[PDB]
Amino acid sequence: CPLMVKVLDAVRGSPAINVAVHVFRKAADDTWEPFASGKTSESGELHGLTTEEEFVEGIYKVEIDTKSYWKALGISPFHEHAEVVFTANDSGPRRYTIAALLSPYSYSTTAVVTNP
Amino acid sequence: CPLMVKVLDAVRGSPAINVAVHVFRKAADDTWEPFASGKTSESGELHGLTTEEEFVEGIYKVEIDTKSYWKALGISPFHEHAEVVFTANDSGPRRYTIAALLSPYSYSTTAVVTNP
Amino acid sequence: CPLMVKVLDAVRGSPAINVAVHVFRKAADDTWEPFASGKTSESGELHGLTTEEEFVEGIYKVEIDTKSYWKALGISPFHEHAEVVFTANDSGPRRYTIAALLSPYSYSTTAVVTNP
Amino acid sequence: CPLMVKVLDAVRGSPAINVAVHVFRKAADDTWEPFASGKTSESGELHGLTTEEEFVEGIYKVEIDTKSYWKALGISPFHEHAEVVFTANDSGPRRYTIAALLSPYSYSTTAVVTNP
Numbered sequence: 001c002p003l004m005v006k007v008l009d010a011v012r013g014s015p016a017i018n019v020a021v022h023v024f025r026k027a028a029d030d031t032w033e034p035f036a037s038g039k040t041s042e043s044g045e046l047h048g049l050t051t052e053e054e055f056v057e058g059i060y061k062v063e064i065d066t067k068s069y070w071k072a073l074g075i076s077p078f079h080e081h082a083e084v085v086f087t088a089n090d091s092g093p094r095r096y097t098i099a100a101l102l103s104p105y106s107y108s109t110t111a112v113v114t115n116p
Numbered sequence: 117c118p119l120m121v122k123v124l125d126a127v128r129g130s131p132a133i134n135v136a137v138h139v140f141r142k143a144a145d146d147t148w149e150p151f152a153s154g155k156t157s158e159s160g161e162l163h164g165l166t167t168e169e170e171f172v173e174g175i176y177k178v179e180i181d182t183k184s185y186w187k188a189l190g191i192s193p194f195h196e197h198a199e200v201v202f203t204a205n206d207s208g209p210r211r212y213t214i215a216a217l218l219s220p221y222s223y224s225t226t227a228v229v230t231n232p
Numbered sequence: 233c234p235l236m237v238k239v240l241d242a243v244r245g246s247p248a249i250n251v252a253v254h255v256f257r258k259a260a261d262d263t264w265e266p267f268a269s270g271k272t273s274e275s276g277e278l279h280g281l282t283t284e285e286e287f288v289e290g291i292y293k294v295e296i297d298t299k300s301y302w303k304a305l306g307i308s309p310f311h312e313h314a315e316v317v318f319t320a321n322d323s324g325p326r327r328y329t330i331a332a333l334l335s336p337y338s339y340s341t342t343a344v345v346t347n348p
Numbered sequence: 349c350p351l352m353v354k355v356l357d358a359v360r361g362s363p364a365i366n367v368a369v370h371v372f373r374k375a376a377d378d379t380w381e382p383f384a385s386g387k388t389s390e391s392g393e394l395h396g397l398t399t400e401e402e403f404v405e406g407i408y409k410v411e412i413d414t415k416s417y418w419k420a421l422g423i424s425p426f427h428e429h430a431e432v433v434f435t436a437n438d439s440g441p442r443r444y445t446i447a448a449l450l451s452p453y454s455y456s457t458t459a460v461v462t463n464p
C-alpha cells in the first residue's frame with residue numbers, strides 16, 4: 001500500500017468517518033485525471049487506493065470532501081474541500097501517508113513518508 | 117480590504133516573505149479564471165488583492181506557491197502549493213483573512229472572517 | 233511590545249475574544265513565578281503584557297485558558313489549557329508573537345520572532 | 349492500551365523517533381506526580397504507558413521533549429517542550445491517542461478518543 005489517507009476531526013476528537021476522497025494524477029496534457037477514490041473507514045483511514053506498479057513518479061492531487069462532512073454534522077464550514085498537491089519522487093522503497101486534521105474554518109495536512 | 121492573505125514560516129519562526137499568491141474565481145462554465153495575484157510583504161501579509169465591489173459572491177481559490185518559497189531556502193518540500201477553496205460572501209460581504217502556516221512536509225490554513 | 237499573544241477560534245473562524253492568558257517566569261529556585269496576565273481583545277490579541285526592560289532572558293510559560301473559553305460557548309473541550317514554554321532573549325532582546333489556533337480537541341501554537 | 353502517544357516531524361515528513369515523553373497525574377496536593385514515560389519508536393509511537401486499572405479519571409499532563417529532538421537534528425527550536433494537559437473522564441470504554449506534529453517554531457496537538 002504505497003499511498004494511504006487518514007482524516008481526523010478536531011472538533012469531536014475522533015476519526016473523520018465516511019469522508020469522500022478522490023486522487024488525481026496530472027496528465028501530460030497538464031490536466032487532472034482521476035484514478036482512485038473511496039470513503040474513510042471507521043478509523044478515519046482509506047487504504048488500497050493504488051499499487052506500487054501504478055503509483056509512478058508524477059504530480060498528484062488528493063481532494064478531501066470536507067464540506068459534505070461538516071454539513072453532515074450540522075456545522076457550517078469555510079472550505080469547499082481540502083486539496084493536497086505533491087510530487088511523488090522515487091528514491092528507494094517509499095510509502096506515503098497523507099494525513100488531514102479538520103476543523104470547520106481550518107485544516108492541517110501533513111505527509112509522512114516512510115521506508116518499509 | 118475584503119481579502120487578505122498572511123503566510124508564516126514554522127521552521128524559522130518568521131513571516132514567509134515574498135511568497136507568490138494567486139487568486140482564482142470559478143466562472144459560469146465551471147472553469148477557474150484568474151482574479152488577482154501578488155507577493156507577501158516583509159510582514160508576511162498580502163493586502164489590496166481586491167475591492168468590495170469586485171469581490172462578489174462566488175467560489176474562490178487561493179493558491180500559495182509554497183514550493184518556490186522552500187526551494188529559495190534550499191529545502192525540497194512535499195507540497196507543490198497550499199490551496200484554499202471557499203465560497204465567499206454567501207451571506208453578504210465580509211472581511212476574509214486567509215492564513216497559512218508552512219512547514220516543508222506540512223501546512224495549515226485558517227480563515228478569520230469578520231463583519232465589515 | 234516585546235511579547236504579544238494572539239488567539240484564534242478554528243470552529244467559528246474568528247478571533248478568540250476575552251480569553252484569559254497568564255505568563256510565568258522560571259525563578260532561581262526552579263519555581264514558576266507569575267509575570268503578567270490579561271485577556272484577549274476583540275481582535276484576539278493581548279498586547280502590553282511587559283516591557284523591554286522587564287522582559288529579561290529567562291524561561292517563560294504562557295498559559296492560555298482554552299477550557300473556560302470553550303465552556304463559555306457550550307463546548308466541553310479536551311485540554312485544560314494551551315501552554316507554550318520557551319527560552320526568551322537568549323540572543324539579545326527581540327519581539328515575540330505567540331499565536332494559538334484553537335479547536336475543541338486540538339490546538340496549534342506558533343511563535344513569530346522578529347528583531348527590534 | 350488506554351493511552352498512546354504519537355509524534356510526527358513536519359520538517360522531514362517522518363515519525364519523530366527517540367523522543368522522550370513523560371506522563372504526570374495531578375495529585376490531591378495539586379502537584380504533578382510522574383507515573384509513566386518512554387521514548388517514541390521507529391514509527392513515532394509510544395505504547396504501553398499505562399493500563400485500564402491505573403488510568404483513572406483525573407487531570408493528566410503529557411510532556412514531549414521536543415527541544416532535545418530538534419537539537420539532535422542540528423535545528424534551533426523555540427519551545428522547551430510540548431505539554432498536553434487534559435481531564436480524563438469515564439463515560440464508556442475509551443482509548444486516548446495524543447498526537448503531536450512538530451516544527452522548530454510551532455507544534456500542533458490533537459486528541460483522538462475512540463471506543464473499542
Ligand SMILES: COc1cc(C(=O)c2cc(O)cc(F)c2)cc([N+](=O)[O-])c1O
Nearest residue numbers: 215217224226228331332333340341342
Ligand atoms: C489572522 O492573523 C494571524 C493568524 C495566524 C494563524 O492563523 C495561526 C495558524 C496556526 O497553524 C497556528 C497558530 F497559532 C496561528 C497567525 C498569526 N500570526 O502568528 O501572526 C496571525 O497574525
Ligand SMILES: COc1cc(C(=O)c2cc(O)cc(F)c2)cc([N+](=O)[O-])c1O
Nearest residue numbers: 099101108110112447448449456457458
Ligand atoms: C501519522 O499519522 C497521523 C497524523 C496526524 C496528523 O497529521 C496531525 C495533524 C495535526 O495538525 C496535529 C497533530 F498532532 C497530528 C494525526 C494522527 N493521529 O492523530 O492518529 C496520525 O495517526
